[PDB]
């Protein structure tokens, strides 16, 4: 009898089964809309003066945190917070009153075999392999207007070789890209062999792999760039006891393992207690960047970076 409203960036698949599940336990009417980060992000400020959901669940964190800061977010400590994983205890200080992590992500290439072998090249193994010619029209990643995927890929490369030789390198990888399109649209691409390498977080060309798509994932030499799933209440939320206990839903350790043992798809988690799926890379065993979310998590920054894409890039 009572309502929920989740706007949902993890799968839709998981989005299904999280909803319907949380639905039969505390009687509430519960009914998603799935999107990208960037999708998300735009809807929930187009719709400050009247939210039309209740709770963000999923999506790269940066995005989150700018919401924070634009006063989109309602602030609640779900009681799980104390089982995220230590290394995240500082960003929790700063971000968590109106953040939470859910799930780590971690960023790497995707790369087709059968397209590789057709264009005579080596699978790329460092970000500078991407710019070959013999890649031209062969590439593709996220368009950064729904994807929070390509705003990680920005601030990886700005934080591995600073943002002027960031954008020169993506100025290059774009002659070699033939469109931005959806995230879920780039993995469908390489998997059928539209193109030939991507870029985007490695959970989902684990899954392609597995699923019988000809897909390797490759983690690029060198620092490793990553990402954390966020999850925030909107602020002036229509149900707001029911977005608390989506919160501390999403947070508990059975929950963030239901995406590998029900559906197959390799999402960290984040809950000290859950156990992570064999299939998951093991982010321990990367070199991963001293990753900067709380500044990439600047509502300023997020906007310059994302004009200035726009502006530079196409
Ligand atoms: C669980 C999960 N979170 C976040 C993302 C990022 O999606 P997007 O780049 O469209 O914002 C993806 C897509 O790869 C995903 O599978």
Known sequence: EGRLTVYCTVQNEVCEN????????????????????????????????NPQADIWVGGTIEPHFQAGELGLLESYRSPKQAEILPQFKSLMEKRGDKTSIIYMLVLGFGVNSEKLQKLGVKAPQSWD???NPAFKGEIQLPDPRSSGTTYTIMA????????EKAFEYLKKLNENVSQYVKSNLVTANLSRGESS???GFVHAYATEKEKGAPVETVIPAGKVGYALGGASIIKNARNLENAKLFMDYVL??????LPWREHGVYQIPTNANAKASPSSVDPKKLD????????????????????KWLTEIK
Do not use: N
């Open 197 to 199: 390498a991507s870029i």
């Open 288 to 307: 991963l960047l001293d990753f900067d979310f709380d500044k990439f998590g600047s509502s300023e920054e997020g906007k310059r970076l994302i004009d």
């Open 156 to 163: 990886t490369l700005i934080q591995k070789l600073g943002e």
């Open 129 to 131: 392999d991407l710019l």
């Open 252 to 257: 508990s350790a059975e929950t963030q393992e």
């Open 18 to 49: 999280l909803t319907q599940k949380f639905a039969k336990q505390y009687q509430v009417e519960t009914q998603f809309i799935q999107g990208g980060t960037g999708t998300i992000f735009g809807k929930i400020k187009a719709e400050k003066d």
